[PDB]
Structure 1
Amino acid sequence: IANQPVVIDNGSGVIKAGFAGDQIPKYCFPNYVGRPKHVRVMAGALEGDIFIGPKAEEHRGLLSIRYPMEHGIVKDWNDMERIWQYVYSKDQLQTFSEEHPVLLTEAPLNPRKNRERAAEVFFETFNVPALFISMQAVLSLYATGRTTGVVLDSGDGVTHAVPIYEGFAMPHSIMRIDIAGRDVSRFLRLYLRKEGYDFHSSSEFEIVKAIKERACYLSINPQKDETLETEKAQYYLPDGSTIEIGPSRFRAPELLFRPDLIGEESEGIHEVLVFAIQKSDMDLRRTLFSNIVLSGGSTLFKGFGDRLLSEVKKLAPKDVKIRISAPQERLYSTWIGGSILASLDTFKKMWVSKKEYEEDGARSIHRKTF
């Protein structure tokens, strides 16, 4: 146990978690595994052959990266098991499965079977007394504090805008495209190869992802940066060498506004937002213009909301009072809200009645955790 459990945020690329009652997810690390590739010549050296965490973020070009969750969907379940075990570690948990009424998140629009399999793991294998899993937006409602809102959370490999009302969103006003800067950086690398730069290796591409999170802006111009050309704002490698930029510095980040140009059946961020608004009522939209919530790391862009609002102006009807809530800790805001929910004793029927839960299964899967 009756102490501080853990709030666990997902992420196809970066998973997060932390002890309740705090304001920051105590442990955050990416969603992949690092396994080396060379002969164990010198005995007694770094052995174990499976790295996650500091050694993973340390021995970059010394391992083999493998993400088990794709499009927010885990397929290499065993790798996530080991990632969970990394969370269970003495560096992180120092606990057992039978010690806390832990919390976990899950984005909507997913088959229940994923959650079912996770429940099978954390209840058949792990003897967790109570493990709740909810959506990924009420958390943000707790963070913002408001009841009426339009929650947007730029995931590791997902995007989803949903308008909620007092913690009760429509089961239809749901907009989502599993996308992020991942393929953006991939296409950026494609540009680079058609500019003389191929970074096909796993970690080699992760450095490009650092560049993604480093030199990507969002201008408001339609073709000004396209007709012009930047002078390669030269940055330098951790390796210690030249890093040009090239005019294309906006082309990959500006692509998410019109991602269908890549041969995609998507709809576009602003259109996604508009459609979420369209699926709602009428008077509520008036309030929802004044209720805009942004979350995720892919929101961290130079001129992000400006071009987004320009698209809104060119698309949404009149009498709109835009109120974008885009603070710094948009990522932690989710974990913050989860910690707030974990700070509740009124969580009674929400917490899993483990024994009876296993005796029920499917029905209890559709009943207890949501």
Structure 2
Amino acid sequence: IANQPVVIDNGSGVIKAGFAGDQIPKYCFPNYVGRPKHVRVMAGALEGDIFIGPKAEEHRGLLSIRYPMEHGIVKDWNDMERIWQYVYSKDQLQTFSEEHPVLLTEAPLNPRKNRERAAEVFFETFNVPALFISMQAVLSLYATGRTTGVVLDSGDGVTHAVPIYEGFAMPHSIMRIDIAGRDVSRFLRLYLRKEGYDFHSSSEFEIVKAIKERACYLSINPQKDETLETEKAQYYLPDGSTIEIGPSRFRAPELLFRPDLIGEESEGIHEVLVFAIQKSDMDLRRTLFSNIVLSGGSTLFKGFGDRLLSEVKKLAPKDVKIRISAPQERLYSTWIGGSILASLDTFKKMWVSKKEYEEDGARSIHRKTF
């Protein structure tokens, strides 16, 4: 049934779901499953043993939290099936999976088994008419309104730079590292433990994520701010008590720009971007430096753009125009692109029809994904 297709930006930390043609993702919620930690004792307690969406956030302290996917790869598939069912529930999208094509998204350079199982879940558990699994850089470029650019997407679980010139993707310049917002939040939890505040529960880890979102920033340069030893700032916990953050405010998001702070022998986000640009052809490099597009929630850190510009200037050639485009809707750029793409009449030629899946199976989605 050729109703409006359903666009599901399948983030590692937050899922953004809506119908194609909508200006913004109407149904966004965290990508985790909460289960009641304690014992149900009273008649008339909360119904159901699986809490997903704002119901999980309202009763966050009551629940033990599990994230179905890590680094863009689904680890628990029953939880992912539950969450994608919740996307279709009476609360979210109030619709039937059978009647709407689906535009899914995944990180680049992901395992093939992930795509295979996602297609299997969306064609067998849900009897979707049509599925299309799309990479996210193209959606960032659609949302920002370009055809040329290098998309540096840093989300909850995966950071990656994808260069595209005139709508042609360079698949061999795609850089990816598994350092993203969740790693920064874990590092911030470690630093807070080193202050004296132990946040070992999972709801307390969500509190740490809120701390990272609210009170954390990237200094323009690390050495002078590290040596200054500035004063501490007060953050109010949910229960009313206060904590002194201090150096954890800025030493935590520095994990993006040097993953060796946790022993990972990986590249910084600036090195990811510059390597993606410099692996491209020699003539496209100057154009790619002038068109850098930020995406994902981890690029929203206070002072992120300034530090990234300074680092890319340090790494780029002399007198090269670097211009980083950082739209306001960095969180929802991927979904807005998916909505723009799914609304096109050309989108009918891209998806994998259900009968086409039955004919081939994993081969159909493997061919038509790229």
Q: Distance in 2 between matches of 1:141 and 1:188?
A: 31
| Structure 1 contact 237–243 (Cα < 8 Å) conserved | yes
Q: CA shift at 1:319, angstroms?
A: 3.4
| Structure 2 contact 352–365 (Cα < 8 Å) conserved | no
Q: Distance in 2 between matches of 1:353 and 1:5?
A: 13
RMSD: 1.4
Q: CA shift at 1:313, angstroms?
A: 2.0
Q: Please give the secondary structure, in 2, of the residue aligned with 1:134.
A: strand
TM-score scaled by structure 2? 0.96
Q: Please give the secondary structure, in 2, of the residue aligned with 1:194.
A: helix
Q: Are the structure 2 counterparts of residues 2 and 288 from structure 1 closer, same or farther at C-alpha, using a change threshold of 3 Å?
A: same
Q: Which 4+ runs in 1 deviate beyond 6 A?
A: none
Q: Deviations over 1:208-229 (max 9, x none)?
A: 1101001111111332222222
Q: Deviations over 1:284-342 (max 9, x none)?
A: 11111111111011111221121212222222112311121101101222111111111
The residue that corresponds to 2:19 in the other structure is 19
Q: Deviations over 1:60-95 (max 9, x none)?
A: 110110011011100100000000111010111222
Q: Distance in 1 between matches of 2:118 and 2:60?
A: 29
The residue that corresponds to 1:354 in the other structure is 354
Unaligned 5+ segments in structure 2 are: none
Q: Please give the secondary structure, in 2, of the residue aligned with 1:105.
A: strand
Q: Please give the secondary structure, in 1, of the residue aligned with 2:214.
A: coil
Q: Distance in 2 between matches of 1:199 and 1:254?
A: 20
Q: Deviations over 1:163-222 (max 9, x none)?
A: 101221112011010121322222222222222110000011111110100111111133
Q: Deviations over 1:99-156 (max 9, x none)?
A: 0122111111012211111111111221110111111011111122222210111111
Q: CA shift at 1:353, angstroms?
A: 2.1
Q: Please give the secondary structure, in 2, of the residue aligned with 1:331.
A: coil
| Structure 1 contact 20–343 (Cα < 8 Å) conserved | yes
Q: Distance in 2 between matches of 1:113 and 1:186?
A: 27
| Structure 1 contact 349–368 (Cα < 8 Å) conserved | no
Unaligned 5+ segments in structure 1 are: none
| Structure 1 contact 259–266 (Cα < 8 Å) conserved | yes
Structure 2 residue 366 is the aligned partner of structure 1 residue 363: no
Q: Distance in 2 between matches of 1:101 and 1:120?
A: 14
| Structure 1 contact 23–332 (Cα < 8 Å) conserved | no
| Structure 1 contact 13–156 (Cα < 8 Å) conserved | yes
Q: Deviations over 1:322-367 (max 9, x none)?
A: 1211011012221111111111112233122211321211321222
Q: Distance in 2 between matches of 1:187 and 1:144?
A: 31
Q: Distance in 2 between matches of 1:274 and 1:185?
A: 25
Q: Which moved more, 1:98-107 or 1:360-369?
A: 360-369
Q: What is the aligned residue count?
A: 370
| Structure 1 contact 184–252 (Cα < 8 Å) conserved | yes
| Structure 2 contact 219–250 (Cα < 8 Å) conserved | yes
| Structure 1 contact 228–247 (Cα < 8 Å) conserved | no
| Structure 2 contact 313–322 (Cα < 8 Å) conserved | no
User: Greater helix share, 1 or 2?
Assistant: 2
Q: CA shift at 1:26, angstroms?
A: 1.2
